[PDB]
Each structure stands twice: as C-alpha cells, then as structure tokens.
Amino acid sequence: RKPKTGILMLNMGGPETLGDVHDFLLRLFLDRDLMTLPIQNKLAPFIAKRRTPKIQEQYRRIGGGSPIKIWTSKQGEGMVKLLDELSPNTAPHKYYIGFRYVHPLTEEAIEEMERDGLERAIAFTQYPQYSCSTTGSSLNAIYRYYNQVGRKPTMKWSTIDRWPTHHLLIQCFADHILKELDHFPLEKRSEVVILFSAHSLPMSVVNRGDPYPQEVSATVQKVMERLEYCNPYRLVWQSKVGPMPWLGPQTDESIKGLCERGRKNILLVPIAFTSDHIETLYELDIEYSQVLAKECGVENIRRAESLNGNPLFSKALADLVHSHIQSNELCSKQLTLSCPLCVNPVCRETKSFFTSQQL
Amino acid sequence: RKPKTGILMLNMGGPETLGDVHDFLLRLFLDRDLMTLPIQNKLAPFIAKRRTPKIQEQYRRIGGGSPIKIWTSKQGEGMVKLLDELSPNTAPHKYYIGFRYVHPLTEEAIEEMERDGLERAIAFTQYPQYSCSTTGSSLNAIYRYYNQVGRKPTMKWSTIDRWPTHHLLIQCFADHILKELDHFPLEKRSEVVILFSAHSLPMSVVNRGDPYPQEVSATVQKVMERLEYCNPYRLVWQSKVGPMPWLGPQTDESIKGLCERGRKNILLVPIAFTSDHIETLYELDIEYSQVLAKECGVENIRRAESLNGNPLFSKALADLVHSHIQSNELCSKQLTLSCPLCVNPVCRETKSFFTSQQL
Numbered sequence A, B: 001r002k003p004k005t006g007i008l009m010l011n012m013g014g015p016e017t018l019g020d021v022h023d024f025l026l027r028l029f030l031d032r033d034l035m036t037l038p039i040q041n042k043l044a045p046f047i048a049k050r051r052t053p054k055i056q057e058q059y060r061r062i063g064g065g066s067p068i069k070i071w072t073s074k075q076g077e078g079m080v081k082l083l084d085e086l087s088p089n090t091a092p093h094k095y096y097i098g099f100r101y102v103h104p105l106t107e108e109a110i111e112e113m114e115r116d117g118l119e120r121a122i123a124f125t126q127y128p129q130y131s132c133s134t135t136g137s138s139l140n141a142i143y144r145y146y147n148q149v150g151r152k153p154t155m156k157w158s159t160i161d162r163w164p165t166h167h168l169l170i171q172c173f174a175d176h177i178l179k180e181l182d183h184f185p186l187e188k189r190s191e192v193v194i195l196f197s198a199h200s201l202p203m204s205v206v207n208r209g210d211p212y213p214q215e216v217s218a219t220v221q222k223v224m225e226r227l228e229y230c231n232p233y234r235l236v237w238q239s240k241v242g243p244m245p246w247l248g249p250q251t252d253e254s255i256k257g258l259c260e261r262g263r264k265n266i267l268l269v270p271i272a273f274t275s276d277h278i279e280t281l282y283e284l285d286i287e288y289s290q291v292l293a294k295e296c297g298v299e300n301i302r303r304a305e306s307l308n309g310n311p312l313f314s315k316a317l318a319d320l321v322h323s324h325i326q327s328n329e330l331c332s333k334q335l336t337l338s339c340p341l342c343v344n345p346v347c348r349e350t351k352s353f354f355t356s357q358q359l
C-alpha cells in the first residue's frame, strides 16, 4: 500500500562529515527562531565561516561527524515496524527525517510527505524536553514552510511536541546509568556522583519563560526515582557558547569543583539529547584532565551511552506515536501557552496551525 | 509518658507582628549560611535597620505579620496525633518548632529537646525542596549549636532533609489548584494559566549547584501529572531582592507579559513555601493592577490557598516521619553530596554530623 500515516522525526541534525560543518553552521546562524542578530543575513555567513574550523575539530574529536542520521533512521525503522502492528487502523506507517540544519531538511521532508499523499502527518519532536530554541524552531519551520510556499497542507497534521517523563524513555536512561555504574570498581560504585548534563540555554532565553529547564528537571527526577536514589546527583548544564550569561552550573566547572571537593568518581548522563554529540572539556582535553588528576586525584569520569540504537528506545517512540493516535490530541496543552515574554510573532502562528488542524 | 521521639520542624519563621520585623531581619542578614557580606557583623544591623520600614509595610499589606507559628503548631499537633497511632513503637511523639530567625529559635528548640531527654530527634525541614539557603541553613544551625556549646548530642539524630515529590504533598497542591480554578467562570476555566511561583535564588547561588530549582521543577511536574495537564503552566520565580541577577522569569514580569500577550486569567500557585507570605506587585499595587487591566484587559488574577492548614497536609507530615522511621535512614542520599562549587566549610561538617549519627 501507499503509506497512510507519516511520522516526521524532528531534530536539528548534525554534519555527517567534517565537510558538512560549514553549511550546518550557516543554517543554524540564519535561524531566527533560534537567535536574532543585527544584519543577520550578512552576519550568519561570516560567523559560520569563522567557527567552521573550531567545530570541525570538535567533530573530529568524536569520530569525524555526527551519527544522528544513522541513529534516527534505525530508530525510525524500529518504530514503524512496531506501529504497523500496534495500530493496524493507521497502517502503513512511514517515518520521515526532518532535520533543521542539514539534509534531509524539514522542508524537504514536508515536500516528500505531501507528494506521498499521506492521510495523517505527525510532527514528532526527537527532543524529549521542549525548548523554543529546539522543538519550537522545528515546529515553526513547518508553519514557515506552508506560509513561504503560500499554500495550505494536503495532510492532516498533529504534533507530539514534548515527552520529558515518558515511562520507557525514563526506563532507558535508568538502564544505561546502571550499565555504566557497573564499569566503576565495585568498592566505589556507591560513591559515584551522577551528573546529568543537558545543553545550557542563555539566561535571556531562560528569563523569557522557556519551558526547557523545568522539563529537563522533571526527566532527572523520574530517572532518580526509578533508580531508587541509589547515588547522589546534580543537574548541570553543558557546552555554553560565547561570553553572555548562560544557565549554570556549567558541566566543566562542576566536574572541577567536585574533584576539588573530594568527589573522584563521576558519571555524566546525556539527559536532553539522545544521540552522540560533542563532549565536554574534561572528557576531551588531555592537558585539562591531566591537571585535574594531579591536583585532586580524579579516579574515573565516565559517560553513559546515548540512547542510540537501544530497541526499548524504539519501543518508547512507537508507544508515544500509538498513544498520540489513540488520544486524538493535536498537541500538548503546554504548546497552547507561549512564553510569557515571547517576542517572536511566529510562535503563536505555529500554535494556531496545530490547534486548528482538521480532525 | 515523657516524650520518646522529638520532631524538630524547621523553617525560617516570620515576624508575628510588625514589631517583630527588625529582629527577624537582623538574624536573617547575620546568617552566613544564607549570604556572605564583608564585615557582616557590622553591616547586618545597618541593613536590618534600613529595611525594617519597607518590610513592615509589606507585612501590613498582608494583615500585619506572618501566621507561620500558628499554622506550624497546628500542623505539628495533627502530625503527632497521627504518629502516636501510626508508629506505636516510637510513641509518644512530640513536635518542636525550630525557626531560623524568630522565636522559638532552632537553638532554643534544640535545648528543650535535650532537656526533655528524648531517645530520638528528627530534623524535619518544612521546605519540601532543598536549598542551601533554606534547609541547608537550618541544618547547619543544628551542627553549629553543638559546636558552639562545645559538646555532643544526648539524643540520636536524623533528618528528613527534602520531600519535593511526596504523594500527599502533591495531592494537597492539586486539591488547592482545583478549588481555586472553581472560582474562575466555567467558560474560562480551561484557558486559565497556572503560574507556579517559587521564591527565586541569586544566579550566583544557582550557578554554584544549589539543588532547589531542579527539585521545585519536580514538584511542578508531579502536580501537573496529577492534574492530568488540564491547564497550561509555567514555573516562574518571585520576590527577587536587589540589583544582582536572580533566576527568572520573574513572577511580576511574567504576569505583565502574559496579559500583554492575551492571557487574561492567571492562577498563582505558591509551590515552594507552604505558609502565607508576601505577595507580588500585581497583587498588592493598585496603581499597577489598574495600568495592566487598562492596557491589556486582565480579567482575573487569583492565588491558590497556602497548604499549611489542610488536614491532608498533617497527614502528609506524619506519613513522612513514619516512612523516615521505618526506613532507618539518617538523611537523604542527596545530602551526602555538597554543591559542586560550595565555598562554605560548615556544609561538609553538617553532612558528617548526620551521616555519622549513632544507629
């Protein structure tokens, strides 16, 4: 059969090889849903060119690019196999990858879904916790697509716009933490600090009402509850860019501080981005990790595995899509409230786009 | 019988009448566990003297003082009566009030407990979510008292140092939200924004690793889960004092922004302090509330009733202490980990005090 139900898997994407870095950065610095700059169209190319070498080097340090496309396909394949059996009524299901900044682009994916003549189309964010900078931008792209092409959808749209506490998602994290705890010496396991490390946001964005920090905090609590509070934890924030204030404590400064304070065993947990991504200073820079161990005698810094290809993760994705279908919901209740200090007029347009959809 | 088990209920306290404001402020500005000032012993009295009139005026706007002692007593009474039934092996139970900044002071309470010759003493924070500034300060006072008087406890100590997701607590919040929602016109009820408002922290304290924002966020998610996400929400942060950066969005600014963006019905929820306390600008200031209703036509701003009161709240407190007793725990796993950037040497001492206790 032709596909009946399209599942658009939304994420920012990542450069597949170091050659893909420039254009990735270009599209990112051009995203007005992410950031607004003066003379943006002139400034984005310059910033992209300027930061390309730094970012290529970071991707090189993690194997030569981002594996997001391959992992997202794997998960999409596994999700679709389960849905076809879970929801025969909406079968056949087809997943589509819609990346914000690399091919296949959100717009290229919408264009294919439309030509496929689907009956139903689900904007399924791959960020469990909603930020306007992440899911918001991806959702805004869907609206901006139809508005640029000056026409209306031929498919029935809905969105799964957040899922920070999904039970199978929580189960996956708790499982990966336990597996990584096993790699610490038995005599030290109970002493390990679990540092949940999510990507930071600028304080300007936190202060305008972005939902992300509170949702990330919920995921953390649910994971520790599942783990029966077996170890001590903190939620800290990684990878802040530039000189402006961002939400802290910063992951790097917290690893250093913890080691200076006698905590020699640290387990980093990627709580807010489900694929392998760029690592932190103490994980990557050997000059820095050398100094740390000399001064404070750090014993073990380890990072839990990314949800990547874990099949209980595909079960999570299918469970979410299946529940969404059964519920007949068009979006979360949370999507219907914009940030108290939102200054982007596209946000409410995108909201109405979803809440107003046929069905 | 003579009392067997003491439950020291810890909170900052509040001035019972307007004449109690100066000494309340004095002890607050003197608290090195709360804030660090140069020449603190000299500066605190001056600050306390200078801010007394403004804080008196704020307490006048809410009826002439804080009801915290009366509410804490009532809950203490209810708690104990349930505990005598719940845990006959530790009966009779006796509650003690230990306020940080007003009588009865933490130290006065410790002294009475020792005189009563209790077998067991439980340091039971009345802040559900842990901050170094609140629970941390109250706990450091317990260690600082024995270190001051140069001797050791004659009672077996433990602590219930946080409880941000206790099921009965969550049930109380959800009940009080529903009750308050009933006061909005039924045609408008589903549109009302639930604005959870917790007291803010300075960014310097957030950035050093304070556990509070993540724990408050957890309370919020558990409440919204129980409410089945019936209304849209944001967690915002109130009462920020002075010029320095504090964690936002700020409650006042978010109320203004929401109304300017078409949200005319708002329900404020005191999610992190369980007694009546000083209210916000749009609740207290007639000039401001008028400007707002005129410029963007705000229709209803209501505040959910404070918990300290409700018998399911007493039932929550007793359930906590009973579970604590059954568990044999000396403190949470979380207390065993200090802030990654803690610069207060007393924090580790206090931690050791509890984890090292006999039994």
Ligand code: HEM
Binding pocket: A028, A034, A035, A051, A055, A127, A131, A133, A134, A199, A200, A201, A202, A205, A212, A239, A241, A272, A273, A276, A277, A278, A279
């Ligand atoms: C307003 C908020 C944000 C801004 C301004 C921002 C900024 C940036 C910038 C400039 C880059 C390119 C690398 C560089 O030039 O240094 C980047 C990459 C990235 N960002 Fe963000 N970001 C934001 C929010 C987020 C959130 C909320 C997440 C995760 C859920 C996230 C995840 C990523 C990832 C995965 C990369 C790719 C490189 C890596 O693996 O770290 N970002 N971001």
Ligand code: HEM
Binding pocket: B014, B028, B034, B035, B051, B055, B127, B131, B133, B134, B199, B200, B201, B202, B205, B212, B239, B241, B272, B273, B276, B277, B278
């Ligand atoms: C380092 C963090 C904190 C600082 C520096 C701070 C500062 C202050 C100061 C100076 C006052 C006296 C009133 C004034 O002079 O304006 C005050 C009162 C108060 N604070 Fe905090 N505070 C902090 C954290 C917290 C937290 C986490 C909570 C709640 C859990 C809280 C709840 C209160 C309450 C209830 C009052 C009494 C007056 C009122 O009802 O607002 N504070 N605080």
Ligand SMILES: C[C@H](CCC(=O)O)[C@H]1CC[C@H]2[C@@H]3[C@H](O)C[C@@H]4C[C@H](O)CC[C@]4(C)[C@H]3C[C@H](O)[C@]12C
Binding pocket: A036, A037, A038, A047
């Ligand atoms: C002033 C502005 C702040 C953004 C805003 O208006 O809100 C900032 C944001 C990004 C900045 C630019 C980027 O950091 C890239 C350049 C970096 C150089 O150090 C200065 C010029 C440079 C071209 C910057 C000029 C200026 O400080 C910019 C344009």
Ligand SMILES: C[C@H](CCC(=O)O)[C@H]1CC[C@H]2[C@@H]3[C@H](O)C[C@@H]4C[C@H](O)CC[C@]4(C)[C@H]3C[C@H](O)[C@]12C
Binding pocket: A034, A035, A036, A037, A047, A050, A051, A202, A204, A241, A242, A243, A244
């Ligand atoms: C980190 C990068 C620096 C570019 C460079 O100097 O090479 C700059 C370029 C554009 C900047 C952003 C834009 O100035 C818009 C935002 C302005 C806010 O004051 C801080 C976050 C904010 C989202 C900025 C964060 C950061 O400083 C960015 C992302």
Ligand SMILES: C[C@H](CCC(=O)O)[C@H]1CC[C@H]2[C@@H]3[C@H](O)C[C@@H]4C[C@H](O)CC[C@]4(C)[C@H]3C[C@H](O)[C@]12C
Binding pocket: B036, B037, B038, B047
């Ligand atoms: C010197 C020190 C700066 C270093 C620090 O951040 O601790 C700061 C922290 C608290 C400050 C004081 C407090 O802010 C209270 C006072 C407020 C007055 O309006 C200015 C001076 C005032 C008397 C301040 C002087 C000085 O800047 C102090 C003493």
Ligand SMILES: C[C@H](CCC(=O)O)[C@H]1CC[C@H]2[C@@H]3[C@H](O)C[C@@H]4C[C@H](O)CC[C@]4(C)[C@H]3C[C@H](O)[C@]12C
Binding pocket: B034, B035, B036, B037, B047, B202, B204, B241, B242, B243, B244
């Ligand atoms: C409350 C009062 C603000 C007076 C005012 O309304 O301007 C002042 C006096 C002591 C101050 C505190 C002290 O300066 C110590 C802390 C220093 C940090 O850099 C900011 C928060 C910090 C905790 C301060 C916040 C705020 O400026 C305080 C709390």
Ligand code: FES
Binding pocket: A132, A136, A210, A337, A338, A339, A342, A343, A344, A347, A348
């Ligand atoms: S920026 Fe959050 S809704 Fe627009």
Ligand code: FES
Binding pocket: B132, B136, B210, B337, B338, B339, B342, B343, B344, B347, B348
């Ligand atoms: S300041 Fe948090 S542990 Fe000392």
